[PDB]
């Protein structure tokens with residue numbers, strides 16, 4: 001679920017304000033997205049958007065209001081490491097893995113402050 005994604009980011013990058021840092025970064029971090037991502041961080045976000053797109057195409061999974069962000073799973077954080085619980089159902093596990101891979105990806109990409117609040121109408 002969305003709140004758990006924020007909380008995953010905060011596990012992978014303890015020094016971070018997820019909503020301040022990663023919402024409205026680049027072309028893809030943010031509601032929707034367009035064009036080509038502007039750096040590796042933005043591309044982490046594009047991968048996350050497409051991971052969600054894939055989950056909605058799982059004939060087996062029908063998320064509340066069609067948004068996988070509404071779906072809560074079980075995970076834990078230990079020493080910077082995210083573990084998705086294996087007892088998550090297949091749809092929960094898929095979302096869990098989109099969020100974990102994105103948090104891990106965010107933690108390894110350089111953070112370019114110029115791309116925060118990018119003029120997307122123009123650069124994306």
Ligand SMILES: Oc1ccc2c(c1O)CN1C=CC3=C(CC4=C(C3)OCO4)C1=C2
Nearest residue numbers: 022023024028029030031032045067069
């Ligand atoms: O990184 C993010 C990835 C995407 C999103 C967010 C992120 O910060 C934050 N965020 C906050 C509210 C809503 C969406 C998406 C959506 C809503 C509402 O209703 C329609 O679909 C949303 C997506």
Ligand SMILES: [Ca+2]
Nearest residue numbers: 028030032049
């Ligand atoms: Ca997005």
Ligand SMILES: [Cl-]
Nearest residue numbers: 034035123124
């Ligand atoms: Cl565009």
Ligand SMILES: [Cl-]
Nearest residue numbers: 071072073092
């Ligand atoms: Cl759930």
